[model samples]
Target: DIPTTENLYFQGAMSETPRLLFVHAHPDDESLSNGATIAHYTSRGAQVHVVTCTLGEEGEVIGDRWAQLTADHADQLGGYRIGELTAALRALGVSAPIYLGGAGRWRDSGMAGTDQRSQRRFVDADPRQTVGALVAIIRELRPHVVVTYDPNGGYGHPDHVHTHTVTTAAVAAAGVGPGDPWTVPKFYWTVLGLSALISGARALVPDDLRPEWVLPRADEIAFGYSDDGIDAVVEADEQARAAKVAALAAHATQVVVGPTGRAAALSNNLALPILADEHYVLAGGSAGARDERGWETDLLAGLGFTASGT
Candidate 1:
């Protein structure tokens, strides 16, 4: 049964601007997962909101200068990453994002089964409490659309999986409350198309001379969803693509940028191709008419936005 948000907090007012919200697991996640989409929407004058679940205190530092700022030594990485998140959002053309509860409200839970059990850790939070907090934001914002990680979490990161659970639960609970309930018309889960990734990765490699830009190891191709699951495609223009890359470049600790600024990777050092087209699976919304390729061209297609997807 869907839980009720009768006890959740809300301001009881809706925004004048067209609102869209993203629920993310960590600071850099907003960029890594939805940078292009954020840029595309904000450029079209949509008021974009992002709720990051954690400050990513458990993340791996990239360069030698910030290596000591890990969860082991200084444990102050969360505050520093806030600055990164700020800059990344600015580059993506969105205003400052709201942390799930607030900045430093929840600590990163690290990978699955790492066992850093703090009360403030997101994975450790009671579902009712976490969902209630998100439900409040849903009522206040009254967003027409919402998005988060898929059930499998794109790669099964514990926090990402937990984020999926919290977001879906919150969506279910958003429509049941003492305050005016706001039922989000559409909800989506971010996904990557394996065929698209393979082609995009291959395009990044110029030749044997640029072996570093080659597709990931064959075994790694299974990390993303198969083509059969993709339901939508948001093809960003050049401006949005530049914004996406710029936003990713802001996260120096988590993303390594290439010379041309079109490729990036994480601390694992595997090459990640930055594609202008971000994909998704329609997790809980009715899909609209598809184009020649049979995929949704705009996230807000049926929401009465400008025909050009403005």
Candidate 2:
């Protein structure tokens, strides 16, 4: 049921200024996975957009205040999370959010193999319709660089896996005709380098530190890509890191900040370091520039247009 371009284009013209887009699975995902990257680019004046696929109703609530708000109880956690996500986005210094299929249109499907009886579960949503919706946004925004999860979905969450599939398909389907098509110039898969994550985790649980945090197991560290797999590394400046931490703090229901405020834990309470450098692999498009470390310091570097508004 894909619509043809007879008279189906969106009404506005693409902004002449720079644009960057991110597609995520849940509310705090952008903050957890790419907050620093978002803050870093948006600070340079690029128009950044976040498309959250779900409201994260299935997430485990942290602390006592909202513990009863989960899907099992009042079932109001999803709606309440909208406010938290709003504050988180503000902390990241980005524009307002754009929910896929308009917010509640899709629901979190929980983990893999969980009985998702509801048809609205994102894992069960029609790929064509989802791709079409995303395509419409891509055509309208016309961003030069786009980012999403890798094939593994970071930790292999079902929703995240679906997001990766949908985004990859949408980017391809959005390119209908060169005459009027707004094909994105580049596509990136956000990833953490294995070496980097291990290093950070070890540093967090260093022997000299008092009341030390727990380090991820060897298998957990193996989840990240090898150093050679990453193409770019963005070290968010002090300001951006501060904003990233603030955004992480805003997701209080899902993230628990440590005493030092430099580390955090999810609902599982497993502490992790808040590293400043974010890494990615260019899933599509040509490489532009490289730093001394052989990684692209800027996402928009190779693109023809220079980022504005700094």
Candidate 3:
């Protein structure tokens, strides 16, 4: 049952849907980071809300594709990105109305651990004020789970760090606190998860279209989920494929789309429906990962998700 809140509206069949909210440092992160999962959940009738902490003002376009990314690509690159994001989400099945903090005005905090961290307004936002923003939403939305970048901020981006900082504080303020109570049940830190990327890269071999250069590989599982322990694969065929592409195109400062837009494709990593399974570590609260034994069939599996309907 959806909790009665003061003012916010909880849409969807709450009785059957699990709410998953993802917070990112910038717009592009949501599309690229959680694209497939969003499609997966919405397909199952879960409500997903994405929160982008900032508009990337200090990111570089990876390749030469996104013309707006370059100085000569014509200014207003940020505005163009907004359109791109909307189109992308529409393509995927991210039915939840996309939001951007009202006109979605956000500024990047650049890299953290440096002076740049101190400059962004949101980075230094009053601890109470920032967490209150997220907590207020949690109180209203009443989600079953929350996901944000790991403590490292997933690559040391300042806004990413601030997002983790505030989200952690907000979860605690809401009394979920990453453990015990388990009201939120699961608090996942979106990370690369061991050598999963490496494994995906290896699968790309013989594609001829695969990247000629070898990407780096590492051997550490930040949380306990291994590269081989993926849970579910969201089959997103005939869904909103265009929305996914547009959303990735929106974050001009973050991702660079090639002439064919492959770099910004939702399944650009390895192309979905190609037998790719996703992985996640279980942050099982007070009971710990023991209940799950570090693997599960779905996101809310051991939690008796069937009863919850999502």
- Candidates in order, TM-scores: namely 0.89, 0.89, 0.68
As a whole number from 0 to 100, the lDDT of residue 197 in candidate 3 is: 54
Q: Pick the candidate with the highest lDDT.
A: 1
Regions of model 2 farther than 4 Å from truth: 1-16, 113-115, 178-180, 205-213, 307-310
| lDDT for each candidate structure | 0.82, 0.82, 0.54
* lDDT against true structure, model 1: 0.82
Tens digits of per-residue lDDT, candidate 1, 59-93, equal 88988899989888788888899999999999998
- What is the lDDT, from 0 to 100, of the residue 240 in candidate 1? 89
**What is the per-residue lDDT of model 2 for residues 165-193, given as tens digits with 9 covering 90 to 100?**
99999888777752357778889999977
RMSD from true fold, candidate 2: 7.1
Q: Lowest-lDDT window of 10 residues in candidate 2?
A: 6-15
Model 3, 153-232: lDDT tens digits are 76566677878888777766775542233356667766554444545545544332345223333432234345454332
Q: Candidate 3: give its CA RMSD in angstroms.
A: 7.2
